[PDB]
Structure 1
């Protein structure tokens, strides 16, 4: 009955994201990971690749599923009969930006947002920084699931 949407680009999914997924799935009856796409800017990975990487690393979470979308997140949420967004926060700076979006989403659609604090070990990891470091040859193998690291290296080469 209870449920939440976990949104992001997940380009690619990181161990920080996976931590958030696991914590949401432990506390909500169903969790939907929403891979949100900008049809006007390609990321590193295609939608199909992003979904595949997420599924391969969440096979142990039976109440989680993965879907893509675009446009307003609150539309994606409400069309599935849900009313909650769950997101990870790493810093007070993340909080101020996400706070704005959360209040806008509540204002326009009545959708609530719940934040969860990053695990300390992943506080510095982001998809963007992992891609940048890997582009220049840095070792990011401990920051990404097995479903991701070698696919990332493949894209870079």
Structure 2
């Protein structure tokens, strides 16, 4: 009956993301994780890998499903039969830009956006910083799900 979409590029999914997925799943009947296609083909992990990593990291959430997103997030949301987006806040989130998009999204499609602060212990990880630190030899394994750590280790090896 109720449903939320959690959109992002998830390249790769972090435990900050999983924290938000868990909170959405506890508060909405259904959650869809929408993985957005990388535009100018510039990510670390390809689409199939990103899907697998999210799936493997959310087996404990039976009301959550993973789908590839295309086009405007709001079009995806309304195609899911939902009218809510749930987005996490962390240290370094461009909140003003998130607010601009939220207001635009409301304006064009009537879709609401609910923001929720990620757990403090996961509040400083982002996909980009995690990748950059890992590529330079740093240990971010406590900030990422094990399905991601396995793949990250493989690529770096």
Identify unmatched segments of 5+ residues in structure 2: none
Deviations along 1:80-121, whole A, 9 cap, x unmatched? 111000000124853212101100100111111000011110
- How many Å separate the matches in 1 of 2:48 and 2:93? 31
Equivalent position SS for 1:142: helix
Q: Where has structure 1 moved over 6 Å in runs of 4 or more?
A: none
Query: Where does residue 130 of structure 1 map in the other structure?
Result: 130
Residue 10 of structure 1 contacts residue 35 of structure 1 at CA under 8 Å; is this kept in 2? Answer: yes
- How many Å separate the matches in 1 of 2:49 and 2:38? 15
Question: Paired residues, what number?
Answer: 157
**Residue 11 of structure 2 corresponds to residue 11 of structure 1:** yes
Q: Normalising to structure 2: TM-score of the pair? A: 0.95
Q: Offset of 1:70 from its aligned partner?
A: 2.2
Q: 1:90 to 1:39 in 2, by over 3 A?
A: closer
**Residue 33 of structure 2 corresponds to residue 33 of structure 1:** yes
- How many Å separate the matches in 1 of 2:84 and 2:34? 12
Equivalent position SS for 1:85: strand
